[PDB]
Amino acid sequence: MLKLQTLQALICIEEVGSLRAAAQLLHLSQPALSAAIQQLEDELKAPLLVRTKRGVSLTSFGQAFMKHARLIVTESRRAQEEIGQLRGRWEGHITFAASPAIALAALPLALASFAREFPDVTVNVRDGMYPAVSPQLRDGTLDFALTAAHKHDIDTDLEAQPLYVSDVVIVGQRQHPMANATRLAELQECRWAFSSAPRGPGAIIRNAFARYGLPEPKLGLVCESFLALPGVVAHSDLLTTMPRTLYERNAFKDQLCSIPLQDALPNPTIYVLRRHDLPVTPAAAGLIRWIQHHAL
């Protein structure tokens, strides 16, 4: 041999006065370095070195050439330093968004495992849902998002990799009059806390009512906050839909009961979403692997 190795060796030769000593010091093959310098001299059509009783010195040509060699060796080191600095900041940070089912079950175990493997990466995690996360995924402010989406609706700009097949549960307060219901039609007159979903607030229950041949569900309120949702429901007669993970993991469990209908609800697929054109850091790859491991 590599020209940069030969140039670094030439610099060392000027300093120590010996091709052989410079080879030894740099851990290069002496005959290899000798052949490499010969090849360079042939290409340049002039000798760089002249033999002395001492060892070797630079020729007039070698002194001229060395000014360039030093610039080139320094520039290569500067390039490597700059790339190291830029890469270090890139590899050193992850920012992503996560939906409640991921945030509550997969993430905590995944973050702990991840941090053992990648002790020097700063992770920035926020709540996020599709398509809200889309402009942030696209402008590059969010590296990836872990969110429910409908395969056919996802922006062409985005890659989508399935992560978890989630459950939706209908939930009300522990003593709700409809707690024993078997069919969705039995709930058709209840009032709903419309919760967040890819197609808009309440889209899941609205679409379920529609497919089961029912009128629009009655809007009680819109609660886009999953943090607030279990408590709002616990202290009202509203029904809602939520991921089963949230039903299992909230501060109001003693005050809530799911209503296990014999009518099936959808199982939203949670995806890893990101721009397809955009390179992924090793750490981001590693975190997604850990999240995948804990999402089964």
Annotated binding residues, written as ranges, equal 99, 101
Measured from the CB atom, the residue of 7 and 272 that comes closer to Cl ion is 272
What are the C-alpha distances in Å from 242 to residues 61, 167, 189? 78, 8, 19
Measured from the CB atom, the residue of 184 and 287 that comes closer to a copy of itself is 287
Binding residues for toluene-4-sulfonate: 99, 101
User: Whose CA is closest to 117, among 94, 145, 89, 83?
Assistant: 94
Task: Provide the token pair at 56.
Answer: 């070797």
Residue 154's binding partner out of a copy of itself, Cl ion, none, with CB under 5 to 8 Å set by partner kind: none
Contacts with Cl ion, residue ranges (CB under 5 A): 197-199, 203
Task: Provide the token pair at 136.
Answer: 């942030």
Candidate ranges 31-39, 142-150, 176-184, 273-281; the one touching a copy of itself (CB under 8 A): 273-281
Q: Which of residues 138-157 bind a copy of itself (CB under 8 A)?
A: 155-156
Place of tokens 């002790």: 119
Q: Report in angstroms how near the CB of residue 202 gets to Cl ion at its nearest.
A: 9
Candidate ranges 18-26, 160-168, 256-264, 277-285; the one touching a copy of itself (CB under 8 A): 277-285
Measured from the CB atom, the residue of 50 and 264 that comes closer to a copy of itself is 50
Does 235 bind a copy of itself (CB under 8 A)? Our answer is yes
Give every CB contact of residue 239 below 8 A, 6+ residues apart in sequence: 170, 171, 172, 176, 178, 187, 190, 191, 192, 193, 233, 259
Q: How many residues bind a copy of itself (CB under 8 A)?
A: 79
For the chain, what is the radius of gyration of the CA atoms?
A: 32
Name beta bridge partners: 164: 270
From CA 253, how far away is CA 174, in angstroms rounded?
9
Looking at residue 166, its amino acid is: S
Give every CB contact of residue 89 below 8 A, 6+ residues apart in sequence: none
Binding mask 30-59 for a copy of itself (x = CB under 8 A): -------------xxxxx--xxx-x----x
CA pseudo-torsion sign 211, 216, 220, 222: positive
Measured from the CB atom, the residue of 2 and 296 that comes closer to a copy of itself is 2
Residue 24's binding partner out of a copy of itself, Cl ion, none, with CB under 5 to 8 Å set by partner kind: none
Measured from the CB atom, the residue of 35 and 50 that comes closer to a copy of itself is 50
Q: Which of residues 164-193 bind a copy of itself (CB under 8 A)?
A: none
User: Which residue is nearest to Cl ion, using beta carbons?
Assistant: 199
Does 67 bind a copy of itself (CB under 8 A)? Our answer is yes
Does 76 bind a copy of itself (CB under 8 A)? Our answer is yes
Looking at residue 243, its amino acid is: P
Q: Report in angstroms how near the CB of residue 194 gets to a copy of itself at its nearest.
A: 9
Asked if residues 154 and 134 have their Cβ atoms less than 8 Å apart, the reply is no
Asked if residues 117 and 134 have their Cβ atoms less than 8 Å apart, the reply is no
Q: Report in angstroms how near the CB of residue 13 gets to a copy of itself at its nearest.
A: 16
Asked if residues 57 and 64 have their Cβ atoms less than 8 Å apart, the reply is no
Residue selected from 21, 26, 123, 265 as contacting a copy of itself according to rule CB under 8 A: 123
